[PDB]
Amino acid sequence: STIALSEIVSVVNTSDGRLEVFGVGTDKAVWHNRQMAPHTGSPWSGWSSLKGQVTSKPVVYINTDGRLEVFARGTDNALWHIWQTATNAGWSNWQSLGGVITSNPAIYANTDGRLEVFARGADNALWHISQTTAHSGPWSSWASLNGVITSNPTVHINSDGRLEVFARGTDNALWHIWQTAPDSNLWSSWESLNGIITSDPVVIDTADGRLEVFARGADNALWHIWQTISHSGPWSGWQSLNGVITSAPAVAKNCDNRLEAFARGTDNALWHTWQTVSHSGPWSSWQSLNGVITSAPTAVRDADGRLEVFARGTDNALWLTWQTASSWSPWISLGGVLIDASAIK
Amino acid sequence: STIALSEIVSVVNTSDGRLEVFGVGTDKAVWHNRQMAPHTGSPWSGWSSLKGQVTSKPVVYINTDGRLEVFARGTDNALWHIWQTATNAGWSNWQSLGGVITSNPAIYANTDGRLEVFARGADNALWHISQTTAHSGPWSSWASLNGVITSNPTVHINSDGRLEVFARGTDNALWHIWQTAPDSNLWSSWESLNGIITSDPVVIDTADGRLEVFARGADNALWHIWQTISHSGPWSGWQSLNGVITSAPAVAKNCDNRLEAFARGTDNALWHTWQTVSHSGPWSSWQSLNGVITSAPTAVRDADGRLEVFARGTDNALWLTWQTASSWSPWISLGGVLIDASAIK
Ligand SMILES: CO[C@@H]1[C@@H](O)[C@H](O)O[C@H](CO)[C@H]1O
Ligand SMILES: CO[C@@H]1[C@@H](O)[C@H](O)O[C@H](CO)[C@H]1O
Ligand SMILES: CO[C@@H]1[C@@H](O)[C@H](O)O[C@H](CO)[C@H]1O
Ligand SMILES: CO[C@@H]1[C@@H](O)[C@H](O)O[C@H](CO)[C@H]1O
Ligand SMILES: CO[C@@H]1[C@@H](O)[C@H](O)O[C@H](CO)[C@H]1O
Ligand SMILES: CO[C@@H]1[C@@H](O)[C@H](O)O[C@H](CO)[C@H]1O
Ligand SMILES: CO[C@@H]1[C@@H](O)[C@H](O)O[C@H](CO)[C@H]1O
Ligand SMILES: CO[C@@H]1[C@@H](O)[C@H](O)O[C@H](CO)[C@H]1O
Ligand SMILES: CO[C@@H]1[C@@H](O)[C@H](O)O[C@H](CO)[C@H]1O
Ligand SMILES: CO[C@@H]1[C@@H](O)[C@H](O)O[C@H](CO)[C@H]1O
Ligand SMILES: CO[C@@H]1[C@@H](O)[C@H](O)O[C@H](CO)[C@H]1O
Ligand SMILES: CO[C@@H]1[C@@H](O)[C@H](O)O[C@H](CO)[C@H]1O
Ligand SMILES: CO[C@@H]1[C@@H](O)[C@H](O)O[C@H](CO)[C@H]1O
Ligand SMILES: CO[C@@H]1[C@@H](O)[C@H](O)O[C@H](CO)[C@H]1O
Ligand SMILES: CO[C@@H]1[C@@H](O)[C@H](O)O[C@H](CO)[C@H]1O
Ligand SMILES: CO[C@@H]1[C@@H](O)[C@H](O)O[C@H](CO)[C@H]1O
Ligand SMILES: [Cl-]
Ligand SMILES: [Cl-]
Ligand SMILES: [Cl-]
Ligand SMILES: [Cl-]
Ligand SMILES: [Cl-]
Ligand SMILES: [Cl-]
Ligand SMILES: [Cl-]
Ligand SMILES: [Cl-]
Ligand SMILES: [Cl-]
Ligand SMILES: [Cl-]
Ligand code: NA
Ligand code: NA
Ligand code: NA
Ligand code: NA
Ligand code: NA
């Protein structure tokens, strides 16, 4: 009935190679901040309001035409969204996709360019809704994929174009459900991947087309589990990456496809562990990137192929550190005052 | 009425991170070779025949569901294709999309997952045909985008999802034509980007969402020209990257998005020039990667984020060199006997 402390922002590397971050202010409006230039250490816009009143993490996704679209639960518990009217232009007004949802939304593009949104319902089942044509309305009716879930859901596309959703169940195990064909409303049953998880799951597709899931375990270590075959079962056993973490993990790919995991430590600093040598390599010991953070970290690869990590500070500002040739940059402040608006805590 | 010596193969980094190369044998069948493992220096399958009888470069493209599909002109001058029946499964038979074509085919996915194929016609105009639904038949009827072209066409998608095609005109200038909306049959007029080019054009999208075109000039230097604004005009002036090149150029992105160009030199070795520092950086002097090659080079970034370059040798085998920590590997032979089947020479 609880999870590790959430990520405070949603981040994208945009169609013109700029990082753009979305969070919630004390006013419950959605604010965003973007790099001026497509480079590590670019100056930032500063925070501007997209307005709205939200009761979930705001979640940005890039349409297949490059237009950003932000999804959030409203004060009426409906799913709301707001989109760029054109790839490098301004924003629509907030509009309702209706429904009643009880989680952060999770979004992915189908192979046919239709966004599909997953969110928990009042019945704690997983519900979904989709664009009826590529990067466009109108949207379908809501429908349920059943199950009973106790975390925010996470969606990723398989290397064969089939969407797959991950969530914690009532038994605290990791559960998943998948499309049986791309672009379809043909889904599997919910299946258990067992384990005990104490955070939202994080899902990545490896360089070799395998889904891999990360989550905090009952021992507060970082655990992971993967498809053993590209876009296929069987799944591996759960394996520990050790550490003791006091937030949700974030995972991103180095530009050589080496996976790197980030999480807050018992000392409230940012910690990370990475694959060494190659994307098939063994994982490093956990090492500190310092800071004092009051959120999970959010990791993304920028247009220079460097990882950048965002986390809320003790002042509730968003702070930022990034990879250098030598190691990592000192934390700088992007300012703002951000709240954890997660629909599940 | 001629162009710089062509690339001998088409290459992809597949949905499971393996390089796979497609060429034509002395028998005029299409042969392919694939890495066993998703890593620089992986062992190779060796050459196997997809059969057929082709009279163009065979051009592989990845469907949005990860299925490879190969397009080639047949001995009847129709467009033929062959596709994986499933992402990591076997191949269909060769099937005809009809038409009469007089160039290599050029392929891109629309934002809605529909492949669209561009090829010169008997009238030397640019024609096109598309999947009617995402990664699937049936295909549309053929239709013309007019113009008069004297090179193989090259297509790339803009950062706002609009397809754009580049080709040399009868005046030896670079010409282009674009979708006015993603997924549409609404096209601009042909417009000139001026210059004089003596190779096929090569088109890349930069990290910052700008189309950039490379081609050999009348002085046998490598020239380039770019959109100055993401997915928009105006275009820059033509700028020389110098060198004296005896083949078509190949261009790929380093994993930090630094562009790198490859071409055969007057000494018939492989030469390259790269952006230094970042994807916004100045270009290096031309430097040699040795070899004795009888084709243009073909460049691709592998699943370890390293560039790998293929070229035909004096023995008509395909040879291969790749980036190391220090510099580049010695050329190794993948064997085979490959011909230049380009529909335009
Ligand atoms: C995003 O942070 C914003 C800040 O930029 C604004 O000045 O004031 C807001 C609320 O007063 C903050 O929550
Ligand atoms: C997303 O914010 C929306 C707002 O746009 C709407 O007018 O009113 C909703 C509450 O009824 C808010 O949650
Ligand atoms: C302009 O296209 C937008 C689309 O991005 C959004 O999902 O949905 C809107 C309609 O709900 C569309 O009008
Ligand atoms: C994933 O959703 C639920 C799970 O939470 C429940 O414990 O068990 C159900 C079936 O036994 C699952 O479908
Ligand atoms: C990841 O799931 C659980 C973990 O939470 C538990 O602490 O340890 C178990 C094995 O002892 C794991 O399988
Ligand atoms: C059809 O492939 C699915 C796969 O998508 C899922 O991750 O894992 C399933 C087995 O647990 C597979 O059967
Ligand atoms: C990222 O951690 C930052 C730290 O870098 C800064 O000096 O001090 C901040 C608090 O003032 C911390 O939250
Ligand atoms: C091998 O590259 C790793 C990098 O992945 C990590 O972020 O930071 C480490 C310490 O700077 C680096 O050594
Ligand atoms: C791809 O190279 C092939 C070779 O693999 C085959 O043994 O023999 C073919 C023709 O005899 C060659 O062209
Ligand atoms: C692609 O190769 C095709 C072959 O498959 C077809 O039977 O016959 C065609 C000639 O009619 C060949 O060009
Ligand atoms: C299985 O899907 C394939 C598709 O990849 C190809 O373009 O076209 C075929 C029909 O021409 C389709 O059947
Ligand atoms: C690009 O195709 C042709 C060009 O080759 C011709 O010289 O001029 C035509 C129009 O003036 C173009 O449309
Ligand atoms: C790239 O197009 C041409 C080039 O071919 C010529 O040699 O030199 C011209 C300028 O002198 C270029 O604009
Ligand atoms: C609408 O944008 C198009 C652009 O796609 C093309 O590269 O260049 C054109 C100008 O030459 C632009 O008008
Ligand atoms: C790539 O160039 C190769 C060279 O590396 C090899 O030693 O000798 C080959 C000819 O035997 C050349 O074509
Ligand atoms: C900075 O990296 C460049 C690389 O892009 C090029 O392929 O090869 C050069 C020589 O090894 C390298 O120094
Ligand atoms: Cl994008
Ligand atoms: Cl509905
Ligand atoms: Cl990996
Ligand atoms: Cl990028
Ligand atoms: Cl808070
Ligand atoms: Cl792919
Ligand atoms: Cl037809
Ligand atoms: Cl660039
Ligand atoms: Cl890759
Ligand atoms: Cl030949
Ligand atoms: Na990007
Ligand atoms: Na698509
Ligand atoms: Na991923
Ligand atoms: Na790939
Ligand atoms: Na590109």
- The experimental resolution of this structure, in angstroms, equals 1.8
Q: Cα A87 to chain center, whole Å? A: 22
Q: What spacing in Å lies between the alpha carbon of B143 and ligand 23's midpoint?
A: 8
By the 8 A CB rule, do A56 and A102 touch? no
Q: What's the token pair of residue B31? A: 């042969």
Q: What's the token pair of residue B69? A: 């599909």
Could you identify the atom of ligand 14 that is nearest to the CA of residue B227?
7
C-alpha span between A254 and A277 (Å, rounded): 11
Query: Which H helix or E strand runs over B295?
Result: none
Listing DSSP states for B208-271 in one string gives: TS-EEEEEEBTTS-EEEEEEEETTEEEEPPPEE----BSS--EEEE-TT--EEEEEEBTTSSEE
Interface with chain B: mutation pick from A227, A257, A323, highest number of B CBs within 10 Å: A257
Which of A241, A225, A242 shows the shortest CA–CA distance to A233?
A: A225
Burial class (CB in 10 A: 0-12, 13-18, 19+), A132: exposed
For chain B, how are helix, strand and coil distributed in percent, rounded to 5? 0, 45, 55
Helical ranges in A189-259 per DSSP H: none
C-alpha span between B138 and A150 (Å, rounded): 43
Q: What are phi and psi of A24, to 5 degrees?
A: -120, 135
Among A47, A50, A295, name the best residue to mutate to test ligand 1's pocket (greatest count of ligand atoms within 8 A of Cβ). Answer: A47
Distance set, CA A14 to CA A40, A50, A272, B98 (Å): 14, 17, 25, 39
Closest residue in B to A163 (Cα–Cα): B65
Which of B181, B233, B226 shows the shortest CA–CA distance to B204?
A: B226
Collect all residues of chain A within an 8 Å Cβ-Cβ radius of residue B209: 14-17, 66, 87
By the 8 A CB rule, do B99 and B113 touch? no
Q: Cα A59 to chain center, whole Å? A: 8
**Cα torsion angle, B68, B72, B74, B79, sign:** positive
Which of B213, B206, B293 shows the shortest CA–CA distance to B247?
A: B293
Which of B253, B96, B17 shows the shortest CA–CA distance to A38?
A: B253
C-alpha span between B56 and B101 (Å, rounded): 10
C-alpha span between A178 and A239 (Å, rounded): 23
Residues with CB under 6 A from ligand 14: B 158, 162, 164, 178, 191, 211, 227, 232-233, 235
Closest residue in B to A87 (Cα–Cα): B160
